[PDB]
Amino acid sequence: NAPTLYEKIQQANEEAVTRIIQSKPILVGFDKAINVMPDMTETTILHAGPPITYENMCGPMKGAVQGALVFEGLAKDLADADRVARSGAITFSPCHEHDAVGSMAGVTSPNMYVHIIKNETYGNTAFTNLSEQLAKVLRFGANDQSVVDRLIWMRDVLGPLLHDAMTFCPEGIDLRLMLSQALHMGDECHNRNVAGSTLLVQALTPYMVQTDFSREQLKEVFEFLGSSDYFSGPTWMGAAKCALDAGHNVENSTIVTTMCRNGVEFGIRVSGIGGNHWFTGPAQRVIGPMFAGYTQEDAGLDMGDSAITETYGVGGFAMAAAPAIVPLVGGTVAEALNYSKEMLEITTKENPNVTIPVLDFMGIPTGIDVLKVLETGMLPVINTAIAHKEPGIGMIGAGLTNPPANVFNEALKALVATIN
Amino acid sequence: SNAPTLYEKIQQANEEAVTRIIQSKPILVGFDKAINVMPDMTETTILHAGPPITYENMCGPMKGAVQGALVFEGLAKDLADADRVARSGAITFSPCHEHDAVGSMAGVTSPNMYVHIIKNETYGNTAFTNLSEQLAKVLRFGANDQSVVDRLIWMRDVLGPLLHDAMTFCPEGIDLRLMLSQALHMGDECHNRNVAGSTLLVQALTPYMVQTDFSREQLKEVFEFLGSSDYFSGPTWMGAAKCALDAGHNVENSTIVTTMCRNGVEFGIRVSGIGGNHWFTGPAQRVIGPMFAGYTQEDAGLDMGDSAITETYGVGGFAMAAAPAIVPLVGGTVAEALNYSKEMLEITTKENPNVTIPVLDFMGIPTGIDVLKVLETGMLPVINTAIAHKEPGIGMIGAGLTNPPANVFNEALKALVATIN
C-alpha cells in the first residue's frame, strides 16, 4: 500500500515543520568566534548571503571586510586590506555554512564575539555576532577609526563581560519564550526590536552585576545597550537559525530552511535538498521610506541574513503584530495586518507558541513551502533596512522586498527530480 | 456681532484647558518619603484613593489598608488595635487627590512610604504616587500580614533610599510622556497592561542605581523585586496623568473632567470650570469581566482606586485599541476594542498628537472628557480596571469594563450653569 508522491511531501513537511515549531533555542553564552565556531581559522572571514568571491562583493560588503581585516591585525589600513583580501590569503565563506547568521554585510571575523544558542529540544547550535549599536557601523560597510575603535571595545570589554555574565546563568535564556512576549508587545523581531531588546537587557542585567567588572565599566556597558533598540536583533536571527536548522535535511520536504542575500544574489536552501546546496538569483531592490535627504538611487540591493526571521514566521510575516513600523517601512496598517494573513497561504502551519493578539492569537505562519509559492504566485514579503551602495556611509532607510522568483522555480525542479 | 457668547466661552475654555493637558510634560525627578515632599502632610495623616470618605464608611479592603499602614507607621501595635486608633479622633483621612497625589486601588499612603516625585516641565506643578509593592499579597488590596509590613519596611529602608539616590545621578529627570508615548506603541495601555512601560523604566533606572553606594548583593535582590511583577510602572503612569490633568484644572468656564476616582463605595470627579476640591459623587459600580478560575462575580467589590485618572488622560480603556493583548483578560472582542477608542472621541475635546495609537492609523489618544458631551450623546466614559475581592487582602480576582455613574455628570452641569458668569 504505497503512499502517493504529493503525500510523501505532506508527510515530510509535517516532520520538518514540527521540528521547527518544537525547537527551543536557548541562549547559553558568548565567546570569540574562533573559540567556539566550526571550521574556523585565523584567516577566515564570514559574510551574509550565499557564496561569493571578494572581487564580486558589493561596495558595503567590501568595506565591512576591510574594516574587519584591520580589526584582526591582518592589515595596516583599508587600502591595504583590499590588497590582502584580493590575494587569496583570506578564506571567505557564508555564515550559514558555519551554523551562523549575520546582519546586513554580516561580516564576522575570528575574534569577534558571538551568541551561542543551543536547541534544547534537538541539540544543534547556532551562532551570531553582536549588534554594534549606532547607525555608522561595520554591518553597513562603514569602517572609520571610530568603527574599529568600537569593535575593539566590544572585543576587550563587552564580549568578556557577557561571557562572564552567562556563566552565572546555568539555565540559559529561553529565546522562543522571550520572542513570543516580544510579539505581544508590538515587535516583529526583524526591524522592530524595541520590546525584545528591553526584555533581553532586563534578563541579562543581574548576571552582569554578578561579574568582576567595575561599576564604571558596568555603567558604560549599560549605556551602550540603551544606545539604540537594535541589540536583540541578532539574537532573534540566531534563534530562528537554531530552529530552522532543526528542520533541514528531511528527505522529501519542500520547506525553505534558509533565505539570505549578500547585496548581489539572493540564496535559499530547502529542507528536502539538504546540506549547503544553494539556489541563487538577483537580490531585489528594497522599496520604502528614505532618510535624511536620500533617494532610491543611493540604495544597494537587498543584503543580510536577517531574512532568516521571515523564514521562521516572524518579521514581515508577523507585521500585523507590529503596526508601529509602518512609518518606518511604508504602506498602510491595513496592509500590514493583511500580510500575516496572506502568508498563511504559502506556509505549512501556525506556530501555536508564538501568537499575534490583533489576529485573535493566531500562531505565526511557519514553513514556506515552495509548492505553495508556485501555486499561489505569492513570493514571501520581507522587511529590511536599506543600506547605501557606497562603502562607509550608514543605514539609509527601510522597506519591503521579495526574493527573486527564479529561485523557487529552480528549487521546485531540483525536488521533483530528486523524488525519482 | 459675536458679543462674546456662551457655548463659545465654553469652547474657548476647553481649548485652553485641553491645551494644558496635551502640552504638559511630566518628568520623573525623584523619590522620597511622603512626609518630606508632599503638601500638607503630618505624621498622623493618611491618604486613600477616591473622593472624601470617613473611616467608618470605608469598605472591607480599604480598612485593612489603613490598618496595615498604621502598624507600619508605628501608630498601633497590631491589627485589632489599629482599627481602634483609626476610629479615634487622632487621624486626618483625606484623598490623594487633595494632596496632588493619586493612589492605586486602596491607594493608602502614609508619611513613611516612598513616592515618585513627578514635576511638570511645561507648567511646573508636581504630582506624587507611591510605589508598587510587587506581589499579589499586597497592601493596596487590603492585606496586612507580618509579611506585608516587612516588605513595606524593606521598601522604605532599602528600595526607597536606593531609588532616591539613583535619581540624584540623573539631573535631567526621566521624561514620562515620552516613555508613555513609546509604551502605547508597544501594546500597553498603561492601566491594565504595563509590561512595556515597566521594562522601559527599570532599564532607564539601572545605570543610575549602579552609580549608587548600595552593595551588589542589594542590587541583586532589588532586580529580583523589579521583575517579580510587570506592574512596577503602573503607579508611574497614574502620576504622569495626574500631573498633566492638574495643569488643565481651574479654567474658568471649562467643562473638562480633571479627575475620575473611586474608593470602593463612591465614584467622584472634578471639573475644570468648577475648580479646587469640589467633588461630584455617585455610587461606585460593579466591574464585569472574565473571572480568575475558582472565583465568581459576587466575590467582587465595587470599583476602587485612582487608576482611572488614566482614562481621564486618554489612556487605559480609552486606549483599549493599542493593547489587543488584554482582550481575554479584560473581556470583549478585538473589533470592540478598536471601536471603543474611536467612540471615545465624541466624549473628548481633541486628540493628543504627542501620544498616538498605531492600529488606528496613529490617531492621538482622545483627550478632555467633556461633561456637556457626555450628557448630549448619552455615552459614558468606558474604563477597564481590575476586579478586586470584596474581602480584605484576597486581591485581584479578574478584570473587566466599568463606567462612572450617570448622575455625577448631571450635577456637574447644574453646578456649571450656576457658576458661568
Automatic annotation (TrEMBL), chain B:
The region annotated as signal peptide is: none
Which Pfam families does the annotation name?
AllG
Family matches, as Gene3D superfamilies: 1.20.5.220, conserved protein of unknown function from Enterococcus faecalis V583 (1.10.10.660), Enterococcus faecalis V583 domain (3.90.1710.10), NAD(P)-binding Rossmann-like Domain (3.40.50.720), v583 domain like (3.90.1700.10)
Q: What is this protein called?
A: DUF1116 domain-containing protein
